[PDB]
């Protein structure tokens, strides 16, 4: 019941007691482990108050006022407000705490050593999609900071009856369009083909290019979503060149500086925030391994290996592995040259081990999903590969939610 | 009930029903996943259900479930259990059991080959000298002059737990490690403790960087005994690089035959505590783990030095670059010497084909994503994108304690 995790490279053993405060479920049973499943998964008055109490208990404990004057009053006041209104409103301090701890609790996030330095933008007074656009532009500008990226989240009004949902329809604030070609292939980002169509097949004027920044599709108060173009001067992009291969720049590659997830649901004290875009900065492998070299994405491995003149006859020449490394050197080199914040996988995974040690010491544990924390290249030469991790679900949390074009009462 | 797994690269969705036949536990609960944890004395009370379950599976596989032969064998095993408190497997049952323990090994990416296992029945063995002879014959057969063949040798099953057969080596062929007084290590740091035991048991160590360890073999619960594998039976491969002529001067070599010897084979409730098995290497086992783990031979520095990469900042990816070149050299060396090896691209593709076939013909394939995904180039192999369900089926291979921690020395 008091569990231990071992690092097999260093023999360091940590003792986890935090998991005993886990609330939600993992998808696993003692008969079957679902650790590699990508997606392992109204609201009444009964359910809401224990959730608020659990959250307020940990909030007042965190400020060393558990069982105090203000603690009992706040508990009473929220209880009064739920009994009356069937919901409640977070104090600004509780919202900031809840958002920072949702990130602290994100077991798939390797960047959590930064969790306490998060800029929380309270957008709970927003009422229209034009107001949403305004808040998102300000977020993008703040977070981008001319390349000196700063972590931020913008929190739109919480769900009420499920009919008045605020939703950002984009999966990330900044992504590249994808169109299926006449000759059967795909131009741009294949992952965004259905979305790039919903933008066109409902308003947008696509420049049908390969790296077209998609428009925002914003939904306020349950209404139909509206299209907005992010001002291009707010979208920091990096042309990708290689520090050795001069032909690399001729590949035509670029990527955007700001990774900003916008389709997750933020849960704090039972309250659900369905529009809560958040951003940090890239780990190099997200772009160079996944975005560029996945077969279902831009899938550039063949072209790069050909220009390197590698033996592509046999897989055992490891031509894919060689090109992969060069592509990721170029991504890192390009961002660093343009003074755009980026972290390589060696530095980020080292940071996470230090974060884990901090969390075990000051908190008694750190939920972590090994399948997601280990980078998608060079796994075993990073320290996290050799680190046993316990995965469990703590709240406040970021959760997945259905894509809105499958749920919108249109 | 049914369970579905999806491949996010190809959108193929498979449906698992085999997990219903799972019995052992995973370590996980509804509230915690132990998927990345490395490691999550038997009476007649529990033995006959285990035997009956196994014999049901065996007679089903041969299309004889419920036949007179099936019923007579159950009756015969039942009587032998209450008469003798254990039972003996037929040769055919042992072969089926060993093949299916491999088929059920959720951490093994090489399972497309499970039905072509050569099973050596060594249940008549009585002494450590006899174990040595069986293991020599296994090594010669499996090596096959570089054309490797999968094999397993099965020594007598556990009785009261005081008479165990054990191979004290973790693998039949491994290099020694020696801790120096200055704190540095010569050879394989993974094997320092076992090397100390061998030395204490009388082994005369050459004290080089690639000394093949002696076999330390325990029969019938007696103290273990040292034996040197005849060197002409240990096939080794000097490592060189197809383009880098200085790579040979690093002085690296490795052995051809990977042969695990510390696991326990469970078949029908019977426990075979000495069951060495062997296949052939996937290149990354040597080039990534054996050579580049910080806690193993740890050659990333010197390789990158000789390559003259920028080693001052990690963001040059000098480690990633040297890692690839080393793994090219491993594959090139084995192929050039005509010693069986498989690269991680081929092995993971074969495993995906295996897994799909197992879903079609068997209703599932238990698989441990954490171990199946190779330790370099993860997402450019197809297993990275493949959802997998992990569960425990029997027959199975299990971990067991290191014998020096449990053995009662006879002196
Ligand atoms: C500041 C630097 C950050 C870095 C380097 C970083 C790194 C990463 C990486 C590499 C992933 C895996 C995502 C993937 O492979 O698709 C991830 C996931 C995630 N990150 Fe972080 N992140 C950062 C900031 C943040 C922030 C500011 C938040 C929230 C406030 C956050 C919340 C999450 C969540 C919830 C996931 C899981 C996404 C999912 O389950 O699909 N991250 N992060
Ligand atoms: C024929 C070629 C084979 C290949 C390419 C192969 C590949 C692998 C690899 C790469 C691993 C992970 C090992 C590690 O990272 O330390 C593994 C694990 C394993 N293999 Fe296979 N294997 C083969 C044959 C066999 C055979 C013949 C058996 C048994 C009869 C077997 C049973 C297992 C088991 C039980 C594990 C789990 C090891 C553990 O939990 O430590 N494999 N295999
Ligand atoms: C703040 C942040 C920093 C960073 N460095 N990286 C990311 C990227 C996280 C991510 C999250 C998701 C899940 C939500 C999307 N939908 C499909 C549910 C992805 F899908 C995805 F591709 C993806 F990159 C975010
Ligand atoms: C037949 C086979 C083919 C192949 N291609 N590869 C292997 C290697 C499996 C392996 C298994 C273990 C299990 C014992 C665990 N104990 C020592 C903690 C190892 F340790 C180890 F190093 C190791 F390589 C085996
Ligand atoms: C099937 C498997 O769970 C899936 O491919 C996961 C593996 N690990 C991952 N890890 C990260 N960081 N991001 C991902 O998208 C994935 N995909
Ligand atoms: C902590 C973690 O479970 C451990 O390092 C695992 C990760 N996956 C692995 N996968 C393989 N094939 N072999 C290993 O030794 C390991 N080690
Ligand atoms: Zn699990």
Look up the CATH number of the domain holding residue B200: 3.90.440.10
Look at the alpha carbons of B296, B297, B302, B306 in this order and tell me if their dihedral is positive or negative: negative
Instruction: Reduce the DSSP state of residue B295 to 3 states and report it.
Output: coil
Looking at the structure, tell me whether residues B206 and B105 fall in a common domain: no
* Domain assignment of residue B8, yes or no: no
Interface membership of B161 toward A (CB under 8 Å): no
Task: Return the best residue to mutate from A107, A294, A372, A391 for the ligand 5 pocket (most ligand atoms within 8 A of CB).
Answer: A372
Looking at the structure, tell me whether residues B119 and B132 fall in a common domain: no
Contacts of B371 (CB under 8 A, 6+ apart): B106, B107, B109
* Domain assignment of residue A98, yes or no: yes
Look up the CATH number of the domain holding residue A253: 3.90.1230.10
Test A35 with B346 for CB contact under 8 angstroms.
Answer: no
Closest CA to B365 of B373, B374, B356: B356
Task: Judge whether A172 is annotated as a binding position.
Answer: yes
Looking at the structure, tell me whether residues B32 and B156 fall in a common domain: yes
**Eight-state DSSP code of residue B155:** P
Q: Cβ(B275)–Cβ(B263) under 8 Å?
A: yes
Closest CA to B122 of B261, B255, B234: B261
Q: How was this structure determined?
A: X-ray
**Distance to chain A for B283, nearest Cα, Å:** 9
Question: Hey, what long-range contacts does B294-302 have (CB within 8 A, 24 or more apart)?
Answer: B294/A9, B295/A8, B295/A9, B295/B189, B295/B190, B296/B188, B296/B189, B296/B190, B297/B188, B297/B189, B297/B252, B298/B189, B299/B250, B299/B252, B299/B326, B300/A381, B300/B326, B302/B250
Q: Which two tokens stand for residue B236?
A: 């080794």
* Bond before A132 cis per omega within 30 degrees: no
What gap in Å lies between CA B335 and CA A318, rounded to an integer? 14
Is the distance from the beta carbon of residue A42 to the nearest atom of ligand 5 less than 6 Å? no
Q: How far is CA B100 from CA A307, B34, B104, B276, B369, in A?
A: 46, 25, 6, 15, 20
* Domain assignment of residue A384, yes or no: no
Look up the CATH number of the domain holding residue A273: 3.90.340.10
Looking at the structure, tell me whether residues B117 and B67 fall in a common domain: yes
* Domain assignment of residue A365, yes or no: yes
**Distance to chain B for A371, nearest Cα, Å:** 7
What gap in Å lies between CA B188 and CA B209, rounded to an integer? 7
Backbone phi, then psi, for B176, in 5-degree steps? -70, 155
Looking at the structure, tell me whether residues A198 and A251 fall in a common domain: no
Closest CA to B368 of B90, B104, B16, B81: B104
Task: Return the best residue to mutate from B4, B8, B35 for the ligand 5 pocket (most ligand atoms within 8 A of CB).
Answer: B8
* Domain assignment of residue A410, yes or no: no
- When CB atoms are compared, the residue of B31, B36, B374 closest to A389 is B36
* Domain assignment of residue A96, yes or no: yes
Is the distance from the beta carbon of residue A256 to the nearest atom of ligand 5 less than 6 Å? no
Interface membership of A30 toward B (CB under 8 Å): yes
Interface membership of B370 toward A (CB under 8 Å): yes
* Domain assignment of residue B332, yes or no: yes
Nearest CA in chain B to A9: B295
Range of the domain at B226: 124-149+164-235+399-403
A contacts of B314 (beta carbons < 8 Å): 344, 346-347
Nearest CA in chain B to A31: B25
Looking at the structure, tell me whether residues A30 and A156 fall in a common domain: yes
What gap in Å lies between CA B119 and CA B274, rounded to an integer? 13
Q: Cβ(A154)–Cβ(A135) under 8 Å?
A: yes
**Distance to chain A for B74, nearest Cα, Å:** 27
Nearest CA in chain B to A327: B317
Looking at the structure, tell me whether residues A247 and A269 fall in a common domain: no
What gap in Å lies between CA B361 and CA A382, rounded to an integer? 38
Could you tell me where the DSSP H helices lie in B309-399? Answer: 318-336, 344-362, 369-372
Test A26 with B22 for CB contact under 8 angstroms.
Answer: no
Contacts of B81 (CB under 8 A, 6+ apart): B44, B47, B48, B51, B87
Could you tell me where the DSSP H helices lie in B23-90? Answer: 44-61, 68-84
What gap in Å lies between CA A210 and CA A206, rounded to an integer? 11
Helix axes B44-61, B68-84, angle to 10 degrees: 160
What gap in Å lies between CA B129 and CA B145, rounded to an integer? 25
Q: Which of residues 116-145 of B touch A (CB under 8 A)?
A: none
Interface membership of A37 toward B (CB under 8 Å): yes
Q: Cβ(A377)–Cβ(B379) under 8 Å?
A: yes
Looking at the structure, tell me whether residues B205 and B99 fall in a common domain: no
Q: Cβ(A370)–Cβ(B36) under 8 Å?
A: yes
Looking at the structure, tell me whether residues A67 and A138 fall in a common domain: no
Exposure on the CB side of residue A237, measured as CA atoms within 13 A: 16
What gap in Å lies between CA A51 and CA A278, rounded to an integer? 24
Q: Is B209 a catalytic residue?
A: no
Residue found under tokens 């406040």: A396
Looking at the structure, tell me whether residues B288 and B328 fall in a common domain: yes
Closest CA to A270 of A44, A19, A22: A44
Looking at the structure, tell me whether residues A56 and A80 fall in a common domain: yes
Looking at the structure, tell me whether residues A274 and A156 fall in a common domain: yes
* Domain assignment of residue B379, yes or no: no
Query: Could you write out the three-class secondary structure of chain A?
Result: CCEEEEECCCCCEEEECHHHHCCCCCCCCCCCECCCCCCCCCCCHHHHHHHHHHHHHHHHHHCCCCCCHHHHHHHHHHHHHHHHHCCCCCCHHHHHHHHHHHHHCCCCCCCHHHCCCCEEEECCCCCCHHHHHHHHHHHHHHHHHHHCCCCEEEECCCCCCCCCCCEECCCECCCECEEECCCCCEEECHHHHHHHHHHHCCCCCCCCCCCCECCEEEECCCCCCEEECCCHHHCCEEECCCCCCHHHHHHCCEEECCCEECCCEEEECCEEECCCCEECCEEHHHHHHHHHHCCCCCCCHHHHHHHHCCCCCCHHHCHHHHHHHHHHHHHHHHHHHCCCCEECHHHHHHHHHHHHHHHHHHHCCCCCCHHHHCCCCCHHHCHHHHECCCECCCCCEEECCCCHHHCCCC
| Count of domains observed in chain B | 3
What resolution, expressed in A, was reported for this entry?
A: 1.9
Q: Which of residues 250-309 of B touch A (CB under 8 A)?
A: 283, 288-289, 292-295, 300
Instruction: Reduce the DSSP state of residue B287 to 3 states and report it.
Output: helix
């Amino acid at each position: 019941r008091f569990l231990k995790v071992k690092n097999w490279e260093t023999d360091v053993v940590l003792t986890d007691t935090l998991h005993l405060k886990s609330t939600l479920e993992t998808g696993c049973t003692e008969h079957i482990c679902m650790g590699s499943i990508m997606l392992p998964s109204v609201r009444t008055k009964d359910q809401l108050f224990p959730l608020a109490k659990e959250f307020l208990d940990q909030y007042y404990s965190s400020i060393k006022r558990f069982g105090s004057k203000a603690h009992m009053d706040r508990l009473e006041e929220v209880n009064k407000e739920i009994e009356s209104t069937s919901t409640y409103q977070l104090k600004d301090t509780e919202l900031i705490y809840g958002a920072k701890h949702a990130w602290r609790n994100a077991s798939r996030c390797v960047g959590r050593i930064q969790w306490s330095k998060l800029q929380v933008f309270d957008a709970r007074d927003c009422t229209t999609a034009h107001g949403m656009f305004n808040y998102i532009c300000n977020h993008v500008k703040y977070a981008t900071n001319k390349g000196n990226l700063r972590s931020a989240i913008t929190i739109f009004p919480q769900r009420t009856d499920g009919k008045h949902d605020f939703r950002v329809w984009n999966s990330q604030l900044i992504r590249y369009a994808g169109y299926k070609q006449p000759d059967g292939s795909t131009l741009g980002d294949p992952a965004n083909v259905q979305f790039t169509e919903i933008c066109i097949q409902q308003g947008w004027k696509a420049p049908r290019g390969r790296f077209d920044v998609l428009p925002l599709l914003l939904q306020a108060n349950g209404n139909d979503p509206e299209l907005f173009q992010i001002p291009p001067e707010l979208v920091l992009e990096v042309p990708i060149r290689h520090p050795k291969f001069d032909w690399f720049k001729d590949l035509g590659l670029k990527w955007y500086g700001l990774p900003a997830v916008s389709n997750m649901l933020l849960e704090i004290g039972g309250l659900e925030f369905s529009a809560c875009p958040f951003s940090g900065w890239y780990m190099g492998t997200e772009i160079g391994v996944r975005d560029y070299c996945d077969n279902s994405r831009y899938n550039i491995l063949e072209e790069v290996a050909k220009k390197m003149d590698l033996d592509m006859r046999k897989t055992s020449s490891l031509w894919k592995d060689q090109a992969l490394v060069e592509i990721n050197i170029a991504v890192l080199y390009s961002f660093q040259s343009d003074k755009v914040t980026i972290v390589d996988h060696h530095s980020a995974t080292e940071s996470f081990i230090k974060h884990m040690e901090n969390e075990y010491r000051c908190r008694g544990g750190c939920p972590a999903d090994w399948v997601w924390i280990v980078p998608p290249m060079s796994g075993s030469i990073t320290p996290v590969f050799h680190q046993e991790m316990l995965n469990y679900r703590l709240t406040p949390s970021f959760e997945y939610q259905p894509d809105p074009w499958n749920t919108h009462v249109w």
